[PDB]
Design a protein around this ligand. Sequence first.
Ligand SMILES: [Zn+2]
Lengths: 111, 57
Amino acid sequence: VNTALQEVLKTALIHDGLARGIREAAKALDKRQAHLCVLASNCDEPMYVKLVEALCAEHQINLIKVDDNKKLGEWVGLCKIPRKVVGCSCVVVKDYGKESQAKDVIEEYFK
Amino acid sequence: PKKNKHKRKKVKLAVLKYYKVISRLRRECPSDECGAGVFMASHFDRHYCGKCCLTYC
Ligand SMILES: [Zn+2]
C-alpha cells in the first residue's frame, strides 16, 4: 500500500526532514544519517547512477523503491496546482515526526 | 566596450566525479563546520575547499 509514501513524506517535510537532491544525498550518506531512501527507476537508462545503490552496502541503509519520476516529484517538493514541473530522483529522509500508524511500514520493509 | 556579467558555469553531472566506483576521486576537507562528505578541489599547484577557503601545498 502507498501510505508508506503518503503518510511519511507529507508529514516529514514539515519538520526539516527532507534531504532532496542527489549530491546532498551523497553528503547525507557520508553523514551516516540516511534512514529512508526513495530511489528512482526512471532514467535515460538506469545504469548511469550507481552511487546511492552501492553506498548503502557500505553504509547499511533501508531502501524502498519506486518506478516514477513525475509522481515522485508530486510526492515530495513543490509544484503548481504552463505549470512548474520539477522532478526529484532520490530522497533521503533524515528525520520524522511522531507517528502511530506509519512507523512500521517504513520500519519493517527490510526485505 | 562593456563589463560582462557572470553566469554560473555548468559542469554536467560531476556528482559521480566526487567518487570512483567505495573509493573517492578527490581529497577530504578537514573541518568542524564541514565534513562528512566535503572534499577539496585538486588544482595543479594547490588544493581547494570552498567554505574554509583552504589552500594546500
Ligand atoms: Zn574547507
